[PDB]
Amino acid sequence: GNEPSDLLEAEQIEKLAKHLPPRTIGYPWNLAFSTSKHGMSIKTLYRAMQDQDSPMLLVIKDSDGQIFGALASEPFKVSEGFYGTGETFLFTFYPEFEAYKWTGDNLFFIKGDMDSLAFGGGSGEFGLWLDGDLYHGRNHSCKTFGNPMLSMKEDFFVQDIEIWSFE
């Protein structure tokens, strides 16, 4: 619903808001899914994405308290191959806020299966990856977004996730 974040501070919201797609102008943030409210199975996440028509802002707070994530061009789904468009981007607040937009290098934006959700593929590590219990994650530099590692180390553990929609 239209409700506060439990993860993001006011100034963090404002930095994210400045990067949201023009198509979201005029829409309030809606909490579409949170691990706190809804649980940690990826199947629950995919269920929450059914029947939605909005880009989705995935916000991860890791066990070190760091915040990073992705703006996905469409609702998360299970896919045979990659999906999404160059509206998709990665972001981090560590060591300071920065959004990593599509670089034009490749089209491997988002990939979903029952065991994982990932961003920025094509060769080597994904830019951002989460397991099917929304608990173990990985992140790495990738060509799709031209990001460095988002968090402190390659592996992270999720403390909380929120997904925000805008329709």
Side-chain angles (χ1 to χ4, degrees), residues 34-68:
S34 75
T35 51
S36 177
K37 294 185 187 203
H38 305 125
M40 294 181 73
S41 298
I42 200 172
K43 193 168 59 182
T44 306
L45 181 161
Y46 290 131
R47 186 74 66 224
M49 297 294 104
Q50 288 178 284
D51 210 32
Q52 307 308 298
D53 182 11
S54 178
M56 295 289 171
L57 183 68
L58 170 64
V59 182
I60 301 161
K61 183 174 194 182
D62 73 18
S63 65
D64 292 315
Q66 299 318 294
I67 303 175
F68 51 90

mmCIF file of all heavy atoms in Angstrom, residues 34-68:
data_model
loop_
_atom_site.group_PDB
_atom_site.id
_atom_site.type_symbol
_atom_site.label_atom_id
_atom_site.label_comp_id
_atom_site.label_asym_id
_atom_site.label_seq_id
_atom_site.Cartn_x
_atom_site.Cartn_y
_atom_site.Cartn_z
ATOM 1 N N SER A 34 7.106 -7.057 0.764
ATOM 2 C CA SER A 34 8.227 -6.911 1.673
ATOM 3 C C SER A 34 8.479 -8.228 2.359
ATOM 4 O O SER A 34 7.544 -8.971 2.655
ATOM 5 C CB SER A 34 8.051 -5.808 2.682
ATOM 6 O OG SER A 34 7.150 -6.188 3.671
ATOM 7 N N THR A 35 9.739 -8.529 2.638
ATOM 8 C CA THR A 35 10.009 -9.757 3.363
ATOM 9 C C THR A 35 9.441 -9.706 4.780
ATOM 10 O O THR A 35 8.956 -10.716 5.290
ATOM 11 C CB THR A 35 11.493 -10.071 3.387
ATOM 12 O OG1 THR A 35 12.241 -8.934 3.841
ATOM 13 C CG2 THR A 35 11.970 -10.455 2.033
ATOM 14 N N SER A 36 9.448 -8.532 5.400
ATOM 15 C CA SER A 36 8.932 -8.386 6.761
ATOM 16 C C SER A 36 7.460 -8.780 6.817
ATOM 17 O O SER A 36 7.030 -9.525 7.711
ATOM 18 C CB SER A 36 9.128 -6.937 7.227
ATOM 19 O OG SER A 36 8.568 -6.743 8.510
ATOM 20 N N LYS A 37 6.671 -8.291 5.875
ATOM 21 C CA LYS A 37 5.247 -8.572 5.889
ATOM 22 C C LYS A 37 4.916 -9.927 5.290
ATOM 23 O O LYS A 37 4.045 -10.630 5.795
ATOM 24 C CB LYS A 37 4.475 -7.502 5.111
ATOM 25 C CG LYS A 37 4.500 -6.106 5.711
ATOM 26 C CD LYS A 37 3.596 -5.168 4.925
ATOM 27 C CE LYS A 37 3.733 -3.724 5.391
ATOM 28 N NZ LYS A 37 2.531 -2.917 5.055
ATOM 29 N N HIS A 38 5.612 -10.288 4.219
ATOM 30 C CA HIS A 38 5.144 -11.339 3.318
ATOM 31 C C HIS A 38 5.955 -12.618 3.283
ATOM 32 O O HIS A 38 5.502 -13.611 2.712
ATOM 33 C CB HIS A 38 5.003 -10.768 1.907
ATOM 34 C CG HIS A 38 4.134 -9.566 1.865
ATOM 35 N ND1 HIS A 38 4.557 -8.370 1.335
ATOM 36 C CD2 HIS A 38 2.870 -9.373 2.316
ATOM 37 C CE1 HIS A 38 3.571 -7.491 1.459
ATOM 38 N NE2 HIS A 38 2.537 -8.075 2.045
ATOM 39 N N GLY A 39 7.128 -12.604 3.888
ATOM 40 C CA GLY A 39 7.966 -13.776 3.933
ATOM 41 C C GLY A 39 9.113 -13.724 2.943
ATOM 42 O O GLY A 39 9.287 -12.755 2.207
ATOM 43 N N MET A 40 9.917 -14.777 2.961
ATOM 44 C CA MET A 40 11.171 -14.832 2.230
ATOM 45 C C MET A 40 11.224 -15.898 1.121
ATOM 46 O O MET A 40 12.265 -16.060 0.461
ATOM 47 C CB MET A 40 12.377 -14.895 3.169
ATOM 48 C CG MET A 40 12.514 -13.606 3.957
ATOM 49 S SD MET A 40 13.926 -13.552 5.073
ATOM 50 C CE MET A 40 15.273 -13.354 3.889
ATOM 51 N N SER A 41 10.130 -16.519 0.750
ATOM 52 C CA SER A 41 10.161 -17.400 -0.415
ATOM 53 C C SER A 41 10.050 -16.594 -1.735
ATOM 54 O O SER A 41 9.172 -15.736 -1.918
ATOM 55 C CB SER A 41 9.053 -18.462 -0.333
ATOM 56 O OG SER A 41 9.211 -19.312 0.801
ATOM 57 N N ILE A 42 10.934 -16.887 -2.685
ATOM 58 C CA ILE A 42 10.873 -16.203 -3.976
ATOM 59 C C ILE A 42 9.544 -16.479 -4.679
ATOM 60 O O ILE A 42 9.079 -15.644 -5.442
ATOM 61 C CB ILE A 42 12.092 -16.544 -4.856
ATOM 62 C CG1 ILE A 42 12.287 -15.493 -5.968
ATOM 63 C CG2 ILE A 42 12.008 -17.943 -5.429
ATOM 64 C CD1 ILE A 42 13.562 -15.689 -6.727
ATOM 65 N N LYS A 43 8.910 -17.620 -4.420
ATOM 66 C CA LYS A 43 7.611 -17.850 -5.030
ATOM 67 C C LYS A 43 6.607 -16.782 -4.587
ATOM 68 O O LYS A 43 5.761 -16.332 -5.376
ATOM 69 C CB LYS A 43 7.085 -19.259 -4.727
ATOM 70 C CG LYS A 43 5.892 -19.634 -5.598
ATOM 71 C CD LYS A 43 5.562 -21.127 -5.500
ATOM 72 C CE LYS A 43 5.254 -21.537 -4.063
ATOM 73 N NZ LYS A 43 4.974 -22.999 -3.926
ATOM 74 N N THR A 44 6.678 -16.365 -3.323
ATOM 75 C CA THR A 44 5.802 -15.293 -2.822
ATOM 76 C C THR A 44 6.054 -13.978 -3.551
ATOM 77 O O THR A 44 5.123 -13.229 -3.863
ATOM 78 C CB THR A 44 5.969 -15.106 -1.320
ATOM 79 O OG1 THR A 44 5.757 -16.372 -0.688
ATOM 80 C CG2 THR A 44 5.000 -14.082 -0.762
ATOM 81 N N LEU A 45 7.328 -13.696 -3.806
ATOM 82 C CA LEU A 45 7.711 -12.522 -4.579
ATOM 83 C C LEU A 45 7.096 -12.593 -5.984
ATOM 84 O O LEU A 45 6.455 -11.635 -6.430
ATOM 85 C CB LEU A 45 9.237 -12.413 -4.588
ATOM 86 C CG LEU A 45 9.872 -11.236 -5.323
ATOM 87 C CD1 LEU A 45 11.299 -11.052 -4.821
ATOM 88 C CD2 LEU A 45 9.897 -11.435 -6.821
ATOM 89 N N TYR A 46 7.247 -13.728 -6.668
ATOM 90 C CA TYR A 46 6.671 -13.831 -7.998
ATOM 91 C C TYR A 46 5.145 -13.705 -7.963
ATOM 92 O O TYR A 46 4.555 -13.108 -8.864
ATOM 93 C CB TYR A 46 7.093 -15.139 -8.674
ATOM 94 C CG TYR A 46 8.569 -15.198 -9.060
ATOM 95 C CD1 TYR A 46 9.336 -16.290 -8.729
ATOM 96 C CD2 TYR A 46 9.173 -14.178 -9.796
ATOM 97 C CE1 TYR A 46 10.647 -16.393 -9.093
ATOM 98 C CE2 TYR A 46 10.503 -14.267 -10.166
ATOM 99 C CZ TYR A 46 11.236 -15.375 -9.821
ATOM 100 O OH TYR A 46 12.545 -15.416 -10.233
ATOM 101 N N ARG A 47 4.497 -14.247 -6.948
ATOM 102 C CA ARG A 47 3.046 -14.135 -6.794
ATOM 103 C C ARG A 47 2.643 -12.653 -6.646
ATOM 104 O O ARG A 47 1.641 -12.207 -7.227
ATOM 105 C CB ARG A 47 2.607 -14.997 -5.587
ATOM 106 C CG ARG A 47 1.106 -15.143 -5.338
ATOM 107 C CD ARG A 47 0.425 -16.066 -6.324
ATOM 108 N NE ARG A 47 0.838 -17.471 -6.218
ATOM 109 C CZ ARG A 47 1.111 -18.257 -7.263
ATOM 110 N NH1 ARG A 47 1.026 -17.796 -8.511
ATOM 111 N NH2 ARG A 47 1.484 -19.513 -7.051
ATOM 112 N N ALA A 48 3.416 -11.899 -5.868
ATOM 113 C CA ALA A 48 3.125 -10.486 -5.648
ATOM 114 C C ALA A 48 3.275 -9.663 -6.927
ATOM 115 O O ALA A 48 2.695 -8.589 -7.044
ATOM 116 C CB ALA A 48 4.035 -9.926 -4.563
ATOM 117 N N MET A 49 4.072 -10.160 -7.873
ATOM 118 C CA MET A 49 4.302 -9.490 -9.136
ATOM 119 C C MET A 49 3.233 -9.794 -10.180
ATOM 120 O O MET A 49 3.142 -9.081 -11.183
ATOM 121 C CB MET A 49 5.682 -9.858 -9.674
ATOM 122 C CG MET A 49 6.821 -9.407 -8.784
ATOM 123 S SD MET A 49 6.971 -7.608 -8.661
ATOM 124 C CE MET A 49 6.277 -7.312 -7.037
ATOM 125 N N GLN A 50 2.449 -10.853 -9.977
ATOM 126 C CA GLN A 50 1.372 -11.151 -10.911
ATOM 127 C C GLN A 50 0.365 -10.005 -10.926
ATOM 128 O O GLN A 50 0.092 -9.381 -9.905
ATOM 129 C CB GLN A 50 0.678 -12.467 -10.565
ATOM 130 C CG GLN A 50 1.522 -13.671 -10.869
ATOM 131 C CD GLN A 50 0.816 -14.951 -10.454
ATOM 132 O OE1 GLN A 50 0.748 -15.278 -9.280
ATOM 133 N NE2 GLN A 50 0.277 -15.681 -11.414
ATOM 134 N N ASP A 51 -0.173 -9.741 -12.120
ATOM 135 C CA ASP A 51 -1.235 -8.776 -12.322
ATOM 136 C C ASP A 51 -0.798 -7.337 -12.032
ATOM 137 O O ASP A 51 -1.636 -6.502 -11.787
ATOM 138 C CB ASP A 51 -2.482 -9.125 -11.507
ATOM 139 C CG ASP A 51 -3.748 -8.659 -12.165
ATOM 140 O OD1 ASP A 51 -3.790 -8.645 -13.419
ATOM 141 O OD2 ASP A 51 -4.709 -8.337 -11.433
ATOM 142 N N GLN A 52 0.496 -7.051 -12.038
ATOM 143 C CA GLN A 52 1.013 -5.701 -11.844
ATOM 144 C C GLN A 52 1.496 -5.155 -13.176
ATOM 145 O O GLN A 52 1.900 -5.921 -14.049
ATOM 146 C CB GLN A 52 2.170 -5.699 -10.836
ATOM 147 C CG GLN A 52 1.874 -6.353 -9.499
ATOM 148 C CD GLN A 52 0.618 -5.849 -8.828
ATOM 149 O OE1 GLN A 52 0.514 -4.675 -8.493
ATOM 150 N NE2 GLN A 52 -0.350 -6.739 -8.620
ATOM 151 N N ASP A 53 1.484 -3.828 -13.310
ATOM 152 C CA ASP A 53 1.914 -3.156 -14.523
ATOM 153 C C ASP A 53 2.631 -1.880 -14.107
ATOM 154 O O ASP A 53 2.065 -0.800 -14.057
ATOM 155 C CB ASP A 53 0.734 -2.835 -15.431
ATOM 156 C CG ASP A 53 1.165 -2.185 -16.732
ATOM 157 O OD1 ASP A 53 2.381 -2.163 -17.032
ATOM 158 O OD2 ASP A 53 0.284 -1.683 -17.448
ATOM 159 N N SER A 54 3.884 -2.042 -13.751
ATOM 160 C CA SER A 54 4.713 -0.955 -13.242
ATOM 161 C C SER A 54 6.154 -1.427 -13.287
ATOM 162 O O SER A 54 6.421 -2.611 -13.092
ATOM 163 C CB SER A 54 4.368 -0.703 -11.773
ATOM 164 O OG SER A 54 5.164 0.305 -11.188
ATOM 165 N N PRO A 55 7.096 -0.491 -13.426
ATOM 166 C CA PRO A 55 8.468 -0.824 -13.032
ATOM 167 C C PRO A 55 8.481 -1.091 -11.520
ATOM 168 O O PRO A 55 7.615 -0.631 -10.779
ATOM 169 C CB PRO A 55 9.240 0.442 -13.411
ATOM 170 C CG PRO A 55 8.249 1.527 -13.312
ATOM 171 C CD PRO A 55 6.963 0.936 -13.782
ATOM 172 N N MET A 56 9.489 -1.837 -11.078
ATOM 173 C CA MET A 56 9.573 -2.271 -9.687
ATOM 174 C C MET A 56 10.910 -1.874 -9.102
ATOM 175 O O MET A 56 11.957 -2.207 -9.650
ATOM 176 C CB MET A 56 9.410 -3.795 -9.592
ATOM 177 C CG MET A 56 8.044 -4.281 -10.009
ATOM 178 S SD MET A 56 6.788 -3.831 -8.807
ATOM 179 C CE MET A 56 5.326 -4.313 -9.725
ATOM 180 N N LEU A 57 10.871 -1.177 -7.969
ATOM 181 C CA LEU A 57 12.083 -0.773 -7.270
ATOM 182 C C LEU A 57 12.365 -1.788 -6.152
ATOM 183 O O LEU A 57 11.656 -1.844 -5.146
ATOM 184 C CB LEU A 57 11.918 0.627 -6.691
ATOM 185 C CG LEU A 57 13.152 1.184 -5.987
ATOM 186 C CD1 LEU A 57 14.273 1.466 -6.980
ATOM 187 C CD2 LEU A 57 12.756 2.423 -5.180
ATOM 188 N N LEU A 58 13.388 -2.600 -6.377
ATOM 189 C CA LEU A 58 13.871 -3.602 -5.425
ATOM 190 C C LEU A 58 14.908 -2.950 -4.511
ATOM 191 O O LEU A 58 15.937 -2.464 -4.984
ATOM 192 C CB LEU A 58 14.506 -4.759 -6.199
ATOM 193 C CG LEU A 58 15.285 -5.786 -5.382
ATOM 194 C CD1 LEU A 58 14.379 -6.532 -4.421
ATOM 195 C CD2 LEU A 58 16.010 -6.743 -6.324
ATOM 196 N N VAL A 59 14.611 -2.954 -3.209
ATOM 197 C CA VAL A 59 15.456 -2.358 -2.191
ATOM 198 C C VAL A 59 15.893 -3.464 -1.237
ATOM 199 O O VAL A 59 15.059 -4.112 -0.602
ATOM 200 C CB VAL A 59 14.700 -1.257 -1.411
ATOM 201 C CG1 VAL A 59 15.608 -0.627 -0.389
ATOM 202 C CG2 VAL A 59 14.111 -0.220 -2.368
ATOM 203 N N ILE A 60 17.204 -3.673 -1.161
ATOM 204 C CA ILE A 60 17.806 -4.668 -0.289
ATOM 205 C C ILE A 60 18.576 -3.948 0.817
ATOM 206 O O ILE A 60 19.395 -3.072 0.530
ATOM 207 C CB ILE A 60 18.805 -5.551 -1.067
ATOM 208 C CG1 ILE A 60 18.119 -6.268 -2.236
ATOM 209 C CG2 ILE A 60 19.488 -6.537 -0.130
ATOM 210 C CD1 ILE A 60 19.106 -6.757 -3.294
ATOM 211 N N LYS A 61 18.325 -4.337 2.071
ATOM 212 C CA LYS A 61 19.190 -3.976 3.181
ATOM 213 C C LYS A 61 19.895 -5.250 3.602
ATOM 214 O O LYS A 61 19.235 -6.235 3.938
ATOM 215 C CB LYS A 61 18.412 -3.377 4.349
ATOM 216 C CG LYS A 61 19.338 -2.927 5.499
ATOM 217 C CD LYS A 61 18.600 -2.213 6.598
ATOM 218 C CE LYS A 61 19.542 -1.492 7.547
ATOM 219 N NZ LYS A 61 18.804 -0.827 8.652
ATOM 220 N N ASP A 62 21.224 -5.248 3.546
ATOM 221 C CA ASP A 62 21.978 -6.436 3.916
ATOM 222 C C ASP A 62 22.286 -6.473 5.420
ATOM 223 O O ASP A 62 21.929 -5.563 6.169
ATOM 224 C CB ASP A 62 23.231 -6.616 3.035
ATOM 225 C CG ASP A 62 24.360 -5.632 3.317
ATOM 226 O OD1 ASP A 62 24.377 -5.001 4.388
ATOM 227 O OD2 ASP A 62 25.263 -5.554 2.440
ATOM 228 N N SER A 63 22.911 -7.560 5.858
ATOM 229 C CA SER A 63 23.156 -7.777 7.274
ATOM 230 C C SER A 63 24.202 -6.828 7.857
ATOM 231 O O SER A 63 24.329 -6.761 9.069
ATOM 232 C CB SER A 63 23.540 -9.228 7.526
ATOM 233 O OG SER A 63 24.765 -9.550 6.918
ATOM 234 N N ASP A 64 24.941 -6.109 7.005
ATOM 235 C CA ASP A 64 25.824 -4.987 7.405
ATOM 236 C C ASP A 64 25.118 -3.635 7.418
ATOM 237 O O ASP A 64 25.739 -2.607 7.707
ATOM 238 C CB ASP A 64 27.000 -4.887 6.441
ATOM 239 C CG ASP A 64 27.924 -6.051 6.550
ATOM 240 O OD1 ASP A 64 28.245 -6.442 7.694
ATOM 241 O OD2 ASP A 64 28.385 -6.554 5.507
ATOM 242 N N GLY A 65 23.827 -3.625 7.112
ATOM 243 C CA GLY A 65 23.032 -2.412 7.099
ATOM 244 C C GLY A 65 23.123 -1.602 5.823
ATOM 245 O O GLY A 65 22.581 -0.503 5.765
ATOM 246 N N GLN A 66 23.806 -2.122 4.801
ATOM 247 C CA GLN A 66 23.970 -1.391 3.556
ATOM 248 C C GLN A 66 22.783 -1.619 2.657
ATOM 249 O O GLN A 66 22.158 -2.675 2.695
ATOM 250 C CB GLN A 66 25.254 -1.797 2.856
ATOM 251 C CG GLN A 66 26.486 -1.503 3.700
ATOM 252 C CD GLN A 66 26.381 -0.159 4.387
ATOM 253 O OE1 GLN A 66 26.379 0.877 3.735
ATOM 254 N NE2 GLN A 66 26.255 -0.176 5.719
ATOM 255 N N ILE A 67 22.505 -0.618 1.840
ATOM 256 C CA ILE A 67 21.321 -0.597 1.006
ATOM 257 C C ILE A 67 21.726 -0.498 -0.450
ATOM 258 O O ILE A 67 22.536 0.349 -0.829
ATOM 259 C CB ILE A 67 20.407 0.566 1.377
ATOM 260 C CG1 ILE A 67 20.027 0.469 2.864
ATOM 261 C CG2 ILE A 67 19.194 0.591 0.458
ATOM 262 C CD1 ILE A 67 19.247 1.610 3.360
ATOM 263 N N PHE A 68 21.135 -1.363 -1.269
ATOM 264 C CA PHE A 68 21.415 -1.371 -2.699
ATOM 265 C C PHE A 68 20.241 -2.106 -3.368
ATOM 266 O O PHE A 68 19.354 -2.646 -2.692
ATOM 267 C CB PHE A 68 22.779 -2.011 -3.012
ATOM 268 C CG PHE A 68 22.957 -3.361 -2.380
ATOM 269 C CD1 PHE A 68 22.580 -4.510 -3.051
ATOM 270 C CD2 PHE A 68 23.459 -3.478 -1.096
ATOM 271 C CE1 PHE A 68 22.703 -5.751 -2.451
ATOM 272 C CE2 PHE A 68 23.589 -4.715 -0.494
ATOM 273 C CZ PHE A 68 23.208 -5.845 -1.177
#
